[PDB]
Design a protein around this ligand. Structure first.
Ligand SMILES: [Mg+2]
Ligand SMILES: [Mg+2]
Ligand SMILES: [Mg+2]
Ligand SMILES: [Mg+2]
Ligand SMILES: [Mg+2]
Ligand SMILES: [Mg+2]
Ligand SMILES: [Mg+2]
Ligand SMILES: [Zn+2]
Lengths: 117, 67, 100, 84, 178
RNA sequence: ACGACCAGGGCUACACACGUGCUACAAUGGCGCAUACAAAGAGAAGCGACCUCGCGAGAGCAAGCGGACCUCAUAAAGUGCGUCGUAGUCCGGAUUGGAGUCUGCAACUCGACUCCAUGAAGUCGGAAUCGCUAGUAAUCGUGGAUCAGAAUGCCACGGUG
């Protein structure tokens, strides 16, 4: 049901449903289910409330949701405040991990502009 | 103070990494962990604080010993 | 290419041959898990101290006849143009035009 | 990045100069071209002039800078925009 | 509270010997701390000022007063009476608790903190400083802030001059640049 | 000095337009598990088994191989069984944060790869325009040259068809 302040879907199998939590992906979701001892092919709807309480503890074992989002934001702020290359590139919305800017780079730049004219 | 216009203000505890626990009234509502306070800030203390976990200088020493 | 560029490659081969052993010993120290960290640090700084041209990785295979830095074939030691010219003149044994 | 088993990389001449600056006051900026060297804790508070390819950009070392390269704080290319 | 008791227990004695005040009612004392946010972009968006007011309420614990333009100013496109600011006057226990929280927690949080200026005294012993980032306060969670803003902190004292104002703040271990 | 040596930088820039590609937009599919069938090649400052360690990239030890002997190297699409159930999704994998690994004096600009997290656009593309007549097109994997490292390029090779 509700874990880490979000509602994991009922129809979805447990592994996929836990992936909905930010900070949780197939690898963490698969582990949580192995540590709690619940089969992955069980729907959240089939799961009893007591098992859900156990899952919530396993999710707390990992930073997720707001505490993670904050960490990511603070790290990006760190790079921009430092004045490093990766910080200036975050400032200009230009690709930070090397990459080419002559062409492509439209995920970072977003949709094209009409040549500013 | 006017009733029902002010945010809930209540006593909380702030624990610095150095272990200095301070009882401060505030609006946070949840106990808050602290990384640095006036007691351990280098400028206030006048001496470099013991390297705390998480600091870039601390990470550099754990992963590799310069000498 | 230029005479200067050929001189450069001869110097690089010479310095890499002269310092081959020195570099090998330091790199083994640096990669030795058992070795003390202090020893590893000294070995790292020592390798930095040694000439850059001494690294074998700064050697560009060039055509022996001309010095071209592109189109090198290692079996022959020549660029594509000089390989073609020799193959056509019969100066490379067993090298004939291939059809399959 | 560089393997941890190898340890952080720093030029020998720069390492020498920085240690001399810790021993003396040496507030004076350290003009260097070693943009590939890693920032070590014993450089915090010092001003290092790192080359951008045409000029040495002064950089005041801070605590968040440790573990990064010097060249990360001296942009090499000047882009001020296309139409501007 | 804890910092108020310190003033009576320790600060008054230090000042009385240092300045040779004859009456205990002659020692400088802190009157009020005013927190000010100039939301000059409120003209474009009313919500921006509301968010700033919420931030000020979280930082001090008192509902902020929404300050308005004293006169129309054609330069900034403001007209008389437009809400363009928020202010909080802290007195008593709430003042002493904000002061304590500031020096003890928020001031050791500004990046590249070399010390607060000591010439910012106004000539009458009233100190004024400007936080350039509000995330230094523990109540300001960086995750739910719309935009990082700044605040002006003014500490109004009964000190007669700058010497006496610096001494009162110094006695509370204020981090002056020295 | 338009010659020569060196250290840094650039050739990787980025409002933009085009050429050539890759990967998609899914159910003739995704994922999990079990399992079958190639060809052609390379290799001594090299290919590097086994075993052990690590989630992993990799590492440590160490045999064999100048090779129809050993190694790269366990083809993949396929097949069987489950699951998903037409959703921007168990599609897609761009971007970005954190942590690594390897090569190399040295990976900041500007390497490849790994792990954990993030989960863009995209629901089949206008005018136009390209390739192909049979083991071809389509699709699927494999090797090589260059090369310290660095292919979605290139040159080759077979599988289904
Ligand atoms: Mg010539
Ligand atoms: Mg080379
Ligand atoms: Mg050069
Ligand atoms: Mg080019
Ligand atoms: Mg997928
Ligand atoms: Mg052979
Ligand atoms: Mg869309
Ligand atoms: Zn502290």
């Amino acid at each position: 049901a509700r874990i880490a302040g979000i509602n994991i879907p009922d129809h979805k199998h447990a592994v996929i449903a836990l992936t909905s939590i930010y900070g949780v992906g197939k690898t963490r979701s698969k582990a949580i289910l192995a540590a709690a001892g619940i089969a992955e092919d069980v729907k959240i709807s089939e799961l009893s409330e007591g098992q859900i309480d156990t899952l919530r503890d396993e999710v707390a074992k990992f930073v997720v949701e707001g505490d993670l989002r904050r960490e990511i934001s603070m790290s990006i702020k760190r790079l921009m405040d430092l004045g490093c290359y990766r910080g200036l590139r975050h400032r200009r919305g230009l690709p930070v991990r090397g990459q080419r800017t002559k062409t492509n780079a439209r995920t970072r730049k977003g949709p094209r502009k009409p040549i500013k004219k | 103070m006017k009733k029902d216009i002010h945010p809930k203000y209540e006593e909380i505890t702030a624990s610095c990494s150095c272990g200095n626990v301070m009882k401060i009234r505030s609006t946070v509502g949840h106990d808050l962990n602290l990384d640095v306070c006036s007691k351990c800030h280098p400028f206030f203390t006048g001496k470099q604080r013991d390297v705390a976990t998480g600091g870039r200088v601390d990470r550099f020493n754990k992963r590799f010993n310069i000498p | 290419a230029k005479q200067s560029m050929k001189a450069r490659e001869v110097k690089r081969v010479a310095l890499a041959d002269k310092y081959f052993a020195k570099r090998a010993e330091l790199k083994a120290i640096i990669s030795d898990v058992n070795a003390s960290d202090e020893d590893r640090w000294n070995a790292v700084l020592k390798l930095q101290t040694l000439p850059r041209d001494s690294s074998p990785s700064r050697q560009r295979n060039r055509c022996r006849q001309t010095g071209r830095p592109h189109g090198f074939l290692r079996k022959f030691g020549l660029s594509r143009i000089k390989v073609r010219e020799a193959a056509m003149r019969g100066e490379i044994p067993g090298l004939k035009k291939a059809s399959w | 990045p560089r393997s941890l088993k190898k340890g952080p990389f720093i030029d020998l001449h720069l390492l020498k100069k920085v240690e001399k600056a810790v021993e003396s006051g040496d507030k004076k900026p350290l003009r260097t071209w070693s943009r590939r060297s890693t920032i070590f804790p014993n450089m915090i508070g010092l001003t290092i002039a790192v080359h951008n390819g045409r000029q040495h950009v002064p950089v005041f070392v801070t605590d968040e800078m440790v573990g990064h390269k010097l060249g990360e704080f001296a942009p090499t290319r000047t882009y001020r925009g296309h139409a501007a | 509270a804890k910092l108020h008791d310190y003033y009576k227990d320790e600060v008054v004695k230090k000042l009385m010997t240092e300045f040779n005040y004859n009456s205990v009612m002659q020692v400088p004392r802190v009157e009020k701390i005013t927190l000010n946010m100039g939301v000059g972009e409120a003209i474009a968006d009313k919500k921006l000022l509301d968010n700033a007011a919420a931030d000020l309420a979280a930082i001090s614990g008192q509902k902020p007063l929404i300050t308005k333009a004293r006169k129309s100013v054609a330069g900034f496109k403001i007209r008389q009476g437009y809400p363009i600011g928020c202010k909080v006057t802290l007195r008593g226990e709430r003042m002493w608790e904000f002061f304590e929280r500031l020096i003890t927690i928020a001031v050791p949080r500004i990046r590249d903190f070399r010390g607060l200026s000591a010439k910012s005294f106004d000539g009458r012993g009233n100190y004024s400083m400007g936080v350039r980032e509000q995330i230094i306060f523990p109540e300001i969670d960086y995750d739910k802030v719309d935009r990082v803003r700044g605040l002006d902190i003014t500490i109004t004292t009964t000190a007669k001059s700058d010497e006496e104002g610096r001494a009162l703040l110094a006695a509370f271990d204020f981090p002056f640049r020295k």
